[PDB]
């Protein structure tokens, strides 16, 4: 599944310094970048426009250009109205996902790293455990029927159509399969006479992967999987470790299952 996630990072050091930066993710791929020093949202892929025409894309550019300056102006007015002290940090997470049929969307706003409000239906709603002043902000935001209409249009109309166009224009890169390469290593001894078997798996795409230390068909339930970490070329890296008595370190193998392998698992034996 490939949901569209639009992220906004707005920082206000004081009343005279501010910047807004943004990015767009389609599944695990970043499709757009939005720098404060740029007049337009920047495409990171040849297919980042989806199936939108040039006029349709320019319409979205003007909407986001106006939104950035207006968001900045409205926040500074809110800080004066609500007597909020600088610095201010605001994050926005908005987008949708099309399901193969029903669809759903979201628009969440965070303040100083905490949820404060979100867009539900046709209006803004405060988080259950939000500060008292948020109700005053909500009351002002819900007076703006034009913005409420535009946000609903973007979430319920523009976003599902954008995802469908992107899945078509970027079908080759989104459906890409990249095989992982694996290799074994030694690690810091877990204790006296114990060994730390390390299994590296790097270069696979997409992200879902399965790595475990095994003896034949028996999976060593002590396998320590790490985090799936990103590479610069939009592939992924994963390390799997196992603490083991040095004698047992015989006949043990690292098994890797990935969609790109088409059932032909990678098996690396120790020694």
């Amino acid at each position: 599944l490939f949901p569209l996630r639009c992220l906004q990072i707005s920082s206000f050091a004081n009343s005279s310094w501010t910047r807004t930066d943004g990015l767009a993710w389609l599944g695990e791929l970043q499709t757009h970048s939005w720098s404060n020093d740029s007049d337009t949202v920047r495409s990171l892929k040849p297919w980042s426009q989806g199936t939108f025409s040039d006029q349709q894309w320019e319409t979205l550019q003007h909407i986001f250009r106006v939104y950035r300056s207006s968001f900045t102006r409205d926040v500074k007015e809110f800080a004066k109205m609500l007597r909020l002290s600088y610095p201010l940090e605001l994050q926005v997470s908005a987008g949708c996902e099309v399901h193969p049929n029903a669809s759903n969307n979201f628009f969440h706003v965070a303040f100083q790293g905490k949820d404060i409000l979100s867009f539900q239906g046709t209006s803004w709603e405060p988080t259950q455990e939000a500060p008292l002043w948020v109700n005053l902000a909500i009351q002002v935001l819900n007076q703006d029927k034009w913005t409420r209409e535009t946000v609903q249009w973007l979430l319920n109309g523009t976003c599902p159509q954008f995802v469908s166009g992107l899945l078509e224009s970027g079908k080759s890169e989104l459906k890409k399969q990249v095989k992982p390469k694996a290799w074994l290593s030694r690690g810091p001894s877990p204790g006296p006479g114990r060994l730390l078997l390390v299994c590296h798996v790097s270069g696979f795409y997409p992200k879902p992967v399965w790595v475990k230390w095994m003896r034949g068909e028996q999976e060593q339930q002590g396998t320590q999987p790490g985090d799936i970490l990103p590479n610069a070329d939009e592939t992924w890296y994963l390390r799997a470790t196992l603490d083991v008595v040095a004698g047992e370190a015989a006949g043990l193998s690292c098994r890797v299952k990935h969609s790109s392998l088409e059932g032909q698992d990678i098996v690396l034996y120790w020694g």
Partner: nanobody, 127 residues
Framework: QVQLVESGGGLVQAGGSLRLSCAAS????????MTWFRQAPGKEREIVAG????????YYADSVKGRFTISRDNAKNTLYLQMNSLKPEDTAVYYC????????????????????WGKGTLVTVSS
């Protein structure tokens, strides 16, 4: 964001023709959905026609199909309404309207969402 100024209204005989124009001041005129409304004496304001991006079929009210044509010159920031075969019931104050609508929304669902309006121009069809 957009200011609209209609012109071209005047007195015309039944069966004649007249072209209205709307000068828009703003940043990205080509991105806006442009509509024509009219308000007849004693009646409520009603939609006449609507247009958006190149290649899309314009909207027309049933009462003006085959007689009115809406068009736009994005290079000149101008909206046009070509009114042919004018009837006495076409006498009304015609209004220019605009709204910034993102892609993925059918034009029929945005005709009640216009935000910027011109002051209007009166066209009267005598005889």
């Amino acid at each position: 964001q957009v200011q609209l100024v209609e012109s071209g209204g005047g007195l015309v005989q039944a069966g004649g023709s007249l072209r209205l124009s709307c000068a828009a001041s703003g940043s990205s005129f080509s991105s806006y959905t442009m509509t024509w409304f009219r308000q007849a004496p004693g009646k409520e304001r009603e939609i006449v026609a609507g247009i958006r991006w190149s290649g899309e079929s314009p909207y027309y009210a049933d009462s003006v199909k085959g007689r009115f044509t809406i068009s736009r010159d994005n290079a000149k920031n101008t909206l046009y309404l070509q009114m042919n075969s004018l009837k006495p019931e076409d006498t009304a104050v015609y209004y220019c309207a605009a709204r910034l609508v993102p892609p993925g929304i059918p034009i029929e669902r945005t005709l009640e969402s216009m935000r910027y309006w011109g002051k209007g121009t009166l066209v009267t069809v005598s005889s």
